[PDB]
Swiss-Prot record, chain A:
Described purpose of this protein according to its UniProt entry: The beta subunit is responsible for the synthesis of L-tryptophan from indole and L-serine.
EC number, as in UniProt: 4.2.1.20
Cellular component GO terms, alphabetical: cytoplasm
Gene expressing this chain: trpB1
Name the record gives this protein: Tryptophan synthase beta chain 1
A Pfam family of this chain: PALP
Length: 385, 387
């Protein structure tokens, strides 16, 4: 439950029962034969795991620095890493005898991931979404609806994510009997930060085995973008003990850190409690959840997972920020150079790995976690016009 | 070069040289050690091959018929099987010392797959596209530009695909020195129909091995949509000699065959000569390429590859049609039932297999080639269906 002084279970009495049932279920099942047999079956024949580790030769050479490898999570069914975590908890909820999935979503990306899983396993799916976001993400709402999920707008409060989260919790408290609260990142009250990370670690395991086959050695630096921090942890974890492996997390710099328009919790947030956990969040002078801005929809969460705040404390991992302008430039660069259109989120890690690579030696290895494809960001990019 | 009486090189004198050079180049590199090592390298680390073979348990049961398997070409990089051919030809062009890639495109899907492969191999890419189609595929045109490809609108003639094809041949005649003409389907003058199919057959091979591992036996019926016919030929080929395997190609029925508003060259076209080949095409009473209609963008090609006309003839394969309405229904079905949003093209194959399944025993296997994903079709479906 604790990663140093970050984490916990800051939740009402009402939520203690479900959370213990969940943590219990996860314990037994965590390594149960079948559950894993089933999970690996869907992950394989449905999600298309494992994803390849691609060496961006053209890009590296154009920079004349370290070797830049892309862990292709953009190729998993759905286009994003979120699918890993979604199949996991959905399958777990199935094993728990649950028949309904609920979740909140800012950009709508996690909502889609949940809807996909729900649909796959024949479970009812209700997605809470701040009316503000719903009117901003017409396509993801449409996408979730095509998959058979129900989108429940939230007009209470500021009609945003925090409001969706509250509504989601509300629903779970009363329906947890047959309803599972599918959290989308390594956040929320225990055991969520741990469960999500375990479900994403598979990224790191493959990426490890793959880099050993392609280079016969572990990488020098691993770079991933950080919103809640799930794709970062998923690929970070397997290398936490390999001391020589540097870990770099990239947060959204937005219009610039000094402009207040960003979503860099770790670099500009303060410690506090939100979503049932103790970690870094972006508040206002009154302890209220403050805005988030990033050309990247998925880097909207007003905070970051506890394990990341921890890793930052013990200095096992370094956390930087990249601006919208930089990410947007990286987006165009990969597309033109490697014929790969990355998600705007991923473009943040790419942007930084690029700077980093330039200041390194030809045979130093950098593994960038390409968390997703950018088909979904074409409209917003079409900014460039 | 000939599949029965279909195929050939019905082209101008100026094109016989580049074509012979290409065929020569393909002959040697076809099985060269290096070439293939690089091809398999890119197909794996960049395109993510192999794609899995998924069992739509929920769908099969909901129909209570044969087992419905899905060859997931929707998971390949780019979201469509077109990438397999784009890589293969781009790579071949590289080995030939070409530095430029040209291509025509109707919906812009082949345009996108060529742009990606060009970007991957540092080649210059110019895409010819009828102005008509350019103005109707805003997102793909943008996609191609993002990939660093130059989109050349064509306003001559009817401003459509046939006009785009004429400009592409034109260009190739003058620039074949350093420019490779990358055809997107099993169509065109020899050796194209053969090269494209070879680059797509990897789909069938994988699917063959994968079904044997999942069912220990070959499938009863293989179903794939058919535009030009490349994803159908890619998954069919490996099973041609397996006489017990049923082969069904599905064409665009559009508004309904009798309406004439479709794109079913095999089921309603006539033998003809176009794009340098003798095969089935949709032509008006004046031997002119007729407009096609389909809710699925990629089934717009006004004809079909010669090898499919041949397979139809000798009856090795059966070809049916599915309407926009039916494909659209499968689109929604697959999405809610398996959590897989198929391409409208593939929705045609899915729609038919579904019908075919219901009239089969539960021990019978059907393999549908899910040629692509539906992210690219959300806009049209939003308008057409609503919600
Ligand atoms: C949601 C998303 C993110 C950010 O979330 P994390 O939990 O921090 O990984 C990053 N990349 C993509 C492609 C996403 O969809
Ligand atoms: C272009 C396309 C087709 C049709 O072309 P074929 O050459 O007949 O395969 C089918 N499915 C998808 C997903 C396509 O993009
Ligand atoms: Na056709």
């Amino acid at each position: 439950m604790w990663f140093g002084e970050f984490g916990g279970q800051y939740v009402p009495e009402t939520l203690i029962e479900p959370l213990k049932e969940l943590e219990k279920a996860y314990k037994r099942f965590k390594d149960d034969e079948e559950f894993n047999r089933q999970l690996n079956y869907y992950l394989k024949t449905w999600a298309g795991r494992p994803t390849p580790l691609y060496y961006a030769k053209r890009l590296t050479e154009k920079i004349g620095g370290a070797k830049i490898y892309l862990k292709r999570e953009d190729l998993v069914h759905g286009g994003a890493h979120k699918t890993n975590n979604a199949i996991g908890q959905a399958l777990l909820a199935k094993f728990m005898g649950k028949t309904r999935l609920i979740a909140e979503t800012g950009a709508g990306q996690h909502g889609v991931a949940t809807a996909m899983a729900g649909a796959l396993l024949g479970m009812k799916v209700d997605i809470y979404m701040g009316a503000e976001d719903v009117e901003r993400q017409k396509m993801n709402v449409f996408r979730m609806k095509l998959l058979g999920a129900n989108v429940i707008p939230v007009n209470s409060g500021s009609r945003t994510l925090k409001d969706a989260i509250n509504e989601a919790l509300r629903d779970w408290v009363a329906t947890f009997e047959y309803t599972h609260y599918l959290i989308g990142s390594v956040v929320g009250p225990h055991p969520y930060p741990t469960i999500v990370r375990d479900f994403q670690s598979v990224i790191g395991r493959e990426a490890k085995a793959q880099i050993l086959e392609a280079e016969g050695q572990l990488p020098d630096v691993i770079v991933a973008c950080v919103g809640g921090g799930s794709n970062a942890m998923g690929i970070f974890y397997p290398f936490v003990n390999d001391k020589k492996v540097k870990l770099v997390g990239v947060e959204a710099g937005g219009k610039g850190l000094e402009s207040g328009k960003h979503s860099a919790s770790l670099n500009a947030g303060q410690v506090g409690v939100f979503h049932g956990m103790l970690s870094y969040f972006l508040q206002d002078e009154e302890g209220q959840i403050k805005p988030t801005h990033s050309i990247a929809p998925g880097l909207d969460y007003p905070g970051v997972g506890p394990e990341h705040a921890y890793l930052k404390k013990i200095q096992r991992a370094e956390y930087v920020t990249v601006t919208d302008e930089e990410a947007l430039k990286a987006f165009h660069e990969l597309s033109r150079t490697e014929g790969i259109i990355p998600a705007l989120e991923s473009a943040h890690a790419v942007a930084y790995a690029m700077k980093l690579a330039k200041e390194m030696s030809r045979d130093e290895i950098i593994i960038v976690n390409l968390s997703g494809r950018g088909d979904k960001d074409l409209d917003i990019v079409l900014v460039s016009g």
